């Protein structure tokens, strides 16, 4: 292992701020100077490679030592969601234990009462999308911040974000001669969530859409080419040219906004406890090399997303799921809500669980729901058509899983791929079958050309606006410039609508008082309401952004 390679050499000081050893702070900054200092940083590793490991999609500061571990095996970061083989020097296998976040309560209790370490305004629980959005906010004119990770690079699952950010009216939207407006915003949400939205939150949900897209717009982002997910009517999904993705784009953005207004952002820092005085007094943090510590702090927004990839929770809610993949990060698992819980928040709709129907087993990675939305059909393994390929999401994850072999086949063309850019990723990660022509297709994923290519012409003649087979409302390409291409897809748990539960201003509500906690925030995936029973596609985004602001600004005011 990589620090025995080096103590061949130097000694304990080649990394470590002293000869003893030991780390300063579990954001690690010495050693990975020390890396860089004889190393170089990534964009220079980048430069000198020939898919490098040391230059990715990942948003953020990325440590070297995330991947380069001192004192124990090292693994790629990659390898959390793909497995590209690569050949990592004091190499292991990527392996995470999920640990309960009340286990070691003794330690927890010890630690508590053993100083009082350090004190801000405004403590922030995750660095995804809503976390930093508050980092900004409570930041930007108000107060002190220290944001805490556990994982040991940012951005949660916003980062992995593909498809676009919903917001509705004046966005950009002038411009493109796209014609929408806000009650067709709320009024989609409801639809697609069944009804049961808190009314109040689609509301703001709605209401702010536009400035939320224009306050990202006044921090450095790119919000301009607008497409059709599934479930809206006028087109509305943000994102940046051509069909890139808004995920990593919108982190990287405010991961460097909140950097450069003062957030004091951790990660390897894991929040295990929320400190009691009923009030919130501080938190309690188990920094991964640091050990334990309190923060006293005024009030605490939670943003720590939600637990879809903890298979054994969303098992306990729809067995269904038992043994099923997951689209989000590592980080996912629900910490959040236990640490929220245990200081009494409320929740509400934990049981919603959101399945996305087109994950690639192969890749161990989601595909966009744009390759649909922009013409692409899918198809079983005989060869056919079997569902309105732009239905919600929950109705077309269960008719794949009604299908021969549980899996089925995005099948788009020459035409579908030019148009959306997120098909070179796919295209460069060797997933993605092609085809001269759709009987050479056929041949590679093993479905009957005449049936797939009936199939295709049929389908074509859908395209002619009227799909007499399943519906499909949009039908927007047709399917025949060459080369063709294919995907086998299947569903995955991907978010969990439900969550604590909170007001517009992001008030955590008290389960036994059935009022707000006092000081204490929420926002993103780690809350419920926002999206009733179904999330549409393109509203995390929008509401981790808009509700991320407000909680940040209402912790500001708190303690202020
Ligand atoms: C593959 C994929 C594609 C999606 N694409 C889209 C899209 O195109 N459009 C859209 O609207 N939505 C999309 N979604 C939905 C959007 O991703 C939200 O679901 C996600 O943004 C949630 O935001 P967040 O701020 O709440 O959390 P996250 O981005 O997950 O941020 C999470 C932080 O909390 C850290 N954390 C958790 N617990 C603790 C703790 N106890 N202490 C410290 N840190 C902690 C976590 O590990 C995590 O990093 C996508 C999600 C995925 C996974
Ligand atoms: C001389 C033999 C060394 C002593 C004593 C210690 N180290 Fe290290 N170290 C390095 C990293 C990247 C870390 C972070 C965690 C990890 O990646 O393993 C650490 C951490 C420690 C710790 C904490 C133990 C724990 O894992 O919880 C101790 C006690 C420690 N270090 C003491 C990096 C390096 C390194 C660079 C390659 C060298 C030469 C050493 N460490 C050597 C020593
Ligand atoms: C910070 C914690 C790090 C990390 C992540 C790495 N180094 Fe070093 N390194 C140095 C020298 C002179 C060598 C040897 C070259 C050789 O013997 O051919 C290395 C080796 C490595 C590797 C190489 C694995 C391989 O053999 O391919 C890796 C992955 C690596 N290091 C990472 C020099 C230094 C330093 C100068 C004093 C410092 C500081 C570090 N390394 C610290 C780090
Ligand atoms: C995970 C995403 C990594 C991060 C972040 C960093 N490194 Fe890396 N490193 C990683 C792998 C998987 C490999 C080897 C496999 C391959 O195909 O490249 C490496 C290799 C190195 C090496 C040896 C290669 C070289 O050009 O010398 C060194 C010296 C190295 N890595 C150092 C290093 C430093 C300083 C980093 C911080 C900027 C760093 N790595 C980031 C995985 C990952
Ligand atoms: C899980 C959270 C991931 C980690 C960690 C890494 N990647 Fe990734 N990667 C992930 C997804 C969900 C996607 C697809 C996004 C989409 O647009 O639908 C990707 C994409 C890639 C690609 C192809 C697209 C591109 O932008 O090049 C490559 C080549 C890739 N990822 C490599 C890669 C590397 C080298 C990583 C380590 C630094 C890495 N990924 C981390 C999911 C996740
Ligand atoms: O781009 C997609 O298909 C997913 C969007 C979301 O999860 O909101």
Known sequence: ???????????????????????????????????????????????????????????????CTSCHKGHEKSVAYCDACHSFGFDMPFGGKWERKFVPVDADKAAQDKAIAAGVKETTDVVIIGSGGAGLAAAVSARDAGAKVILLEKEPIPGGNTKLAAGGMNAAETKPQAKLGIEDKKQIMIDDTMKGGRNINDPELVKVLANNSSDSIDWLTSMGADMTDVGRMGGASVNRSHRPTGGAGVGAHVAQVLWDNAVKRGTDIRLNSRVVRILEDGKVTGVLVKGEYTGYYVIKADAVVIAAGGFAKNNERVSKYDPKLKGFKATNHPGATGDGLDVALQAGAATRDLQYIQAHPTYSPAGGVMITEAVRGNGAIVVNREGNRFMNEITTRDKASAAILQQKGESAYLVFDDSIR??????????????????????????????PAAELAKTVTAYNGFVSGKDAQFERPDLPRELVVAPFYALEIA????HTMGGLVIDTKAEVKSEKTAKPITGLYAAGEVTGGVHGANRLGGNAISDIVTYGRIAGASAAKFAK
């Open 418 to 447: 030019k148009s959306l850019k997120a098909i070179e990723g796919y295209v460069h990660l060797n997933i993605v079958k092609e085809g001269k022509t759709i009987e050479e297709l056929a041949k590679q994923i093993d479905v």
């Open 1 to 63: 292992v990589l620090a025995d390679f080096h103590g061949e050499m130097g000694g304990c000081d080649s990394c470590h701020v002293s000869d003893k050893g030991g780390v300063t702070n579990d954001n690690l900054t010495h050693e990975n100077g020390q890396c860089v200092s004889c190393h170089g940083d990534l964009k220079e590793l980048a430069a000198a490679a020939p898919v490098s490991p040391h230059k990715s999609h990942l948003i953020g500061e990325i440590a």
């Open 491 to 494: 569903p995955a748990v991907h």
